[PDB]
């Protein structure tokens, strides 16, 4: 449905120029601000260039200033990264994003239920969070070794439990197959329902409703603050524990689209270029 493939990425001499285009498929270029991001090699994502929904603004980090361009043909559907006098500190991967909306109460909500908690999550999703939550214990479960000393990394649903300790709550943060197993084992559900309409790659298990009793709910239209109506409901088990779910849905249970969450941001599949 929604799709986003860059391409013109190359082996370039230092000093020579490159042009990256992104081919947008299933919206217009026109209608969002479109932004480049690059992620050079073993480092962390960061954020290039980007062009505003009306194509009059166009903002640039800093060590890229007067060497990269960004603009956009809306007939193609198409946005350019134009890039000169490449530096080898220029090399890596390129990642084309385009920004549908916002919805910033859903992270407060987050924030809020999970603070002072563990969490434990996926390997998918320590992906598209990127960075340890503060203030939590993080626990990653995977079937191969951690890359990252911050967060505990687990290898069963077992020992993620365990690795809580005993706390009062355990919070359950995604992703999908993550849900998919601990869903059995939860007490209680913290769901925010987005009025969105994506298709995504991910999605929430179905949960029988005569399974669950709400007890609150808490509907907000959609305006300049948070682009699509919501609402928080919170969720008790009919006859049960200390674990949690915590999870954002938008229509049918589409919880994510390539590890991001489509109601608010797309990806590209990303172009590597490489100045050597
Ligand atoms: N809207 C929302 O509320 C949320 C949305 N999301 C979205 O969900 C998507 C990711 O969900 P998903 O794709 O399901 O991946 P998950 O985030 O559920 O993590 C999947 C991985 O976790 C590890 N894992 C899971 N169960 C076990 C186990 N029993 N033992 C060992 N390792 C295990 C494996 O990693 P390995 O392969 O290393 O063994 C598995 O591949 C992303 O798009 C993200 O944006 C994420 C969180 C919340
Ligand atoms: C704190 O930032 C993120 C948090 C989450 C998990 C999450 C987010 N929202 C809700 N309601 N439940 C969750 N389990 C997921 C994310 O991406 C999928 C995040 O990055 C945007």
């Known amino acids: 449905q929604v799709q986003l493939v860059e391409s013109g990425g190359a082996l370039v001499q230092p000093g020579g120029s490159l042009r990256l285009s992104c081919a ?3 919206f217009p270029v026109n209608r969002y601000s479109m932004r480049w991001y690059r992620q050079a090699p073993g480092k962390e994502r960061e954020w290039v260039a980007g062009m505003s929904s009306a194509g009059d603004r166009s903002s640039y980090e800093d060590s890229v200033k007067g060497r990269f361009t960004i603009s956009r043909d809306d007939a193609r559907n198409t946005v350019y990264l134009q890039m000169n006098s490449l ?13 549908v909306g916002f919805l910033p109460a859903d992270l407060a909500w987050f924030k809020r239920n999970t603070l002072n908690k ?5 390997r998918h999703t320590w992906e598209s969070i ?34 809580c300790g005993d706390v009062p709550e355990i919070m359950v943060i995604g992703g ?12 209680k559900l913290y769901l925010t329902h987005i009025d969105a309409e994506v298709e995504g790659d991910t999605h929430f298990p ?9 007890v609150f709910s808490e509907f907000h239209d959609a305006d300049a603050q948070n682009s699509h109506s919501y609402c928080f409901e919170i969720l008790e088990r009919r ?28 990806w590209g599949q990303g172009t590597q270029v490489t100045v050597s």
Do not use: H
Not at 118 to 122: A, D, K, S
Not at 138 to 157: A, E, F, M, Y
């Open 87 to 99: 530096k080898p500190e220029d090399t890596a991967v390129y990642y084309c994003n385009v920004n």
């Open 24 to 26: 947008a498929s299933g």
């Open 130 to 163: 990127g960075r340890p939550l503060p203030g939590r214990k993080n626990i990653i479960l995977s079937s191969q070794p951690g890359t990252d000393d911050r967060v505990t990394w687990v290898k069963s649903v077992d020992e993620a439990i365990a690795a």
């Open 118 to 122: 563990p969490v434990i999550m996926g």
């Open 239 to 266: 006859g049960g524990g200390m674990i949690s779910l915590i999870a954002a849905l938008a229509v049918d249970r589409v919880i994510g689209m390539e590890n991001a969450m489509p109601w608010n941001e797309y």
């Open 206 to 214: 179905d949960y029988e409703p005569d399974d669950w009793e709400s």
């Open 176 to 187: 999908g197959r993550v849900y998919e197993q601990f869903l059995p084992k939860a007490q």
